[PDB]
Structures are given as C-alpha cells and as structure tokens.
Write a protein that binds this ligand. Structure first.
Ligand SMILES: CCCCCCCCCCCCC/C=C/[C@@H](O)[C@H](CO)NC(=O)CCCCCCCCCCCCCCCCC
Length: 235
C-alpha cells in the first residue's frame, strides 16, 4: 500500500480496456514495420508541434512466458543488458515489491534538446477469471510527479504512458510428458504514448521511432529467449 495505488489501478485498467483493442481496421493507424511475427503500427498525431504519435506493436515470441517477459522488462538490474536509448537512470523510490519510480535521461537526438523522464514502473498479474480468459502479465510505465525530480534546466521533461502486455499460449504435448519451451509462445502487445514535453521536429521524431521501436522489440525479445533458454519455465 502506497499513495500511487489508485493511479496504478487506473493505468492497468485503461490498458486492459483500450490497449488490447484491434487497430487493424482504423484508417488512422498504419503498419509501419513488419518482420517475422513483429508488427509495429503508428497513428500520426501532431498538435501544435507536439508530436504525440501513439505507437502499438504486437509480437509472438517462442519459448518464453509472459511472466518471464514482464520480469526482464521490469527488472532494473537487467536494464542495461538490453536498453540502448538511455544515457543513465536510477530508482528514485521503491513503492512496493512490484512498483518503483525511476528517473532516466535519454540519449540526445540532434537537433532536439535532450529528454529526461520520471515514471512509475509497476509489474502486475491479472488472473484469468474463467478457463479461456487468458492470464495476463503486464508492466505499466507511466510518468508521475516526484519532489526529488522537479523540472530541470538541462533536459526537456517528456511524459510517457507505456505498457508491455503479455499472454502465454501452451500447446499440450503428446500425452503425459514435460512441457518444453518449444510448446510455449508469448503473445505481446506493446503500446507507447509519448509526449516529448516540448517542440520537436516531427520528421526526425518519426524516423527515430520507426528505427528504435522495432530495434528494441527484436533485441529485448531475443534477450529474454537467451536468458531463459537454459532455465526451467517460470509460468
Ligand atoms: C539514439 C536514439 C535515442 C532515442 C530516444 C528519444 C527520447 C524519448 C523520450 C521518451 C522515451 C520513452 C520510452 C520508454 C522507456 C521505458 O518505458 C522502458 C524502460 O527503459 N523502455 C522501453 O519502453 C523501450 C523503448 C525503446 C525505444 C524508445 C525510442 C523512442 C523514439 C521516439 C521517441 C521520441 C519522443 C521524445 C522526443 C525525443 C527528441 C528527439
């Protein structure tokens, strides 16, 4: 129990309600990148030079579970093993054993000023209510205010709302035998809503995002495969 419990609930529920809705039929969402089971879509949104482009990606990763995926996405001790867009980060506050507040600076992209971000990062399990309701593991990373990290004059403060949402499919093997990682697949939906917090050139933001989101999703998912391949399956 902590002062951000209701905000956590709010963000989790929003993501379970809206982030899992199909965008495939919406004229405003475009398939920007596809590779293997990975599809990255974007809706181009610019409001008075504030480029908000909502981003949504789906992926299907063999040999890993949603619990595993969300653990490696959330766990700060393995962050630098896969993250490539950050200059530095540190934990500002531990709120609960599944919830922390992180301050991070991003690598500068010319010609825009450097961005920093201040966000609550929470990992949650959403129980299946019925058999056939998928169990869902989710990590929500969303900007919050914290007195220890006011606006500074060195960076533009971005605001983020990101979720990594995972459901795991197990194909029953032949009879009474072990479920191997060949029999498991993690369905991922990744969404990112980023307000750069200030003016940025749209064409540059868009080129970066189109390169960087796909790069992250391949690298991060391959990483989870690599770290887990030897291990017993954590469902
Ligand atoms: C050299 C390239 C540097 C690009 C950095 C641009 C600055 C972006 C500012 C906010 C980004 C927020 C992304 C979310 C981070 C955390 O939830 C999480 C844990 O670290 N990681 C990811 O979701 C992993 C996401 C990895 C992919 C992120 C790239 C995003 C590129 C487009 C965003 C640009 C918006 C801000 C304006 C930057 C000025 C050009």
């Amino acid at each position: 129990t902590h002062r951000f419990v209701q905000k956590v609930e709010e963000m989790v529920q929003n993501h379970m309600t809206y982030s899992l809705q199909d965008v495939g039929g919406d004229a405003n969402w475009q398939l920007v990148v596809e590779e293997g089971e990975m599809k990255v879509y974007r809706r181009e949104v610019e409001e008075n030079g504030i480029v908000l482009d909502p981003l949504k990606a789906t992926h299907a990763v063999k040999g890993v579970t949603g619990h595993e995926v969300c653990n490696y996405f959330w766990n700060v001790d393995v962050r630098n093993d896969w993250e490539t867009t950050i200059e530095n980060f540190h934990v500002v506050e531990t709120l609960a054993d599944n919830a922390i507040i992180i301050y991070q600076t991003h690598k500068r992209v010319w010609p825009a000023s450097q961005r920093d971000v201040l966000y609550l990062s929470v990992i949650r399990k959403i129980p299946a209510l019925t058999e056939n309701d998928p169990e869902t593991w989710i990590v929500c990373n969303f900007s919050v205010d914290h007195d220890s990290a006011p606006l500074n004059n060195r960076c533009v403060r971005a605001k983020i709302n990101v979720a990594m949402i995972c459901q795991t499919l197990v194909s029953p093997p032949e009879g009474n035998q072990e479920i191997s990682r060949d029999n498991i697949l993690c369905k991922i939906t990744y969404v990112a809503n980023v307000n750069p917090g200030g003016w940025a050139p749209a064409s540059v933001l868009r080129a970066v995002a189109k390169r960087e989101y796909p790069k992250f999703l391949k690298r991060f998912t391959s990483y989870v495969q690599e770290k887990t391949a030897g291990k017993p399956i954590l469902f």
